Design a protein around this ligand. Sequence first.
Ligand SMILES: C[C@@]1(N2C(=O)c3cccc(O)c3C2=O)CCC(=O)NC1=O
Lengths: 229, 173
Amino acid sequence: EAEALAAARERSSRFLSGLELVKQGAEARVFRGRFQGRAAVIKHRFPKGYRHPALEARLGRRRTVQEARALLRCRRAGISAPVVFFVDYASNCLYMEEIEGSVTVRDYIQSTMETEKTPQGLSNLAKTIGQVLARMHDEDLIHGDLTTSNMLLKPPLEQLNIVLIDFGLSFISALPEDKGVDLYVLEKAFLSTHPNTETVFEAFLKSYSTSSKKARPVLKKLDEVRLRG
Amino acid sequence: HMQLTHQLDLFPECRVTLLLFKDVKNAGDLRRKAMEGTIDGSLINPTVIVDPFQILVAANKAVHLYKLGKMKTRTLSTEIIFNLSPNNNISEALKKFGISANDTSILIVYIEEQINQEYLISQVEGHQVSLKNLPEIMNITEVKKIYKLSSQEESIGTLLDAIICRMSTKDVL
Ligand SMILES: C[C@@]1(N2C(=O)c3cccc(O)c3C2=O)CCC(=O)NC1=O
């Protein structure tokens, strides 16, 4: 079993070496290329040498499984996110549709602030994000790592077609506190990355509150989490 | 009459071949031969296949578990068919996505890493067609029923997208 497992991991390494590395986080490298004729991204949860190898294998597997489950949940719930093509548990690689020609919300906001020199034209974007994340929370899906880089705008850009990505830290919870923390994390990332765009986040919160069926306890928990930190 | 072949990207020495037939008269005998293994390959119901990508995804996962020695079924030929189903019930998957004695259209899929294709084709009492004919054979109402596809899924993507997402994640619940 060890020989066959080793051969499969070597196959995976060979395949990745033919792809373009496009992103790297703390825990995953994202590669892009073709998979059986379709534009694809392959996410490899890669081990760090200084951690215990048994723990690293468990962690890589857990985050691969959780992202695959989240993406299936999204698709069946009508939440736009990449579809999953293939999950390789020998290598902790997740093969996914590429969101071709897309731009991060982060880049879109920053470009707008640079050119328009004002956030007034981003309220529509904020309202869309509010509707999308309200739908996600109403499916009891906690993203776990919300930033404006984990939301993509699919072309044509001005249609505001938001695609959610990178669910490795996601989990299922109905608890308003968990949803409040999800929003609090987004808020801190948003305000620190996009200074002086508070009206945008205000419009996001208004739309989330209108769009979600159970936002009242969530937004109260958001206030509590903010105060505690 | 024309095959479709694609290399597997993760298993580059492997080639997948698809052969499509219509007006088949001997589906019962073909089914028996595949069961006995005399006919090497997967006999698949083309009425529920929306795109060759569906076949290639099933084939990639089957070869992967074949080489790891972790297939859910006993042979690569059945594993390919099983991977097409959205569910983990093996006998149901083989009934719904395999061929039955009454079928008049058949898709043959096999993988090489060499088979006499002419002899294989001669075994089918039917007319081979291009895989570009597959969409005229596919029955969308049967596809939506088997995969339990919803309008919600169709609003954010294609039917193929929803099918693949189901195929690819059914092994982790
Ligand atoms: C970089 C980009 N991209 C995805 O398509 C994608 C899908 C799933 C997860 C994930 O992290 C990503 C990701 O970063 C986006 C911009 C582009 O045109 N192509 C890409 O590969």
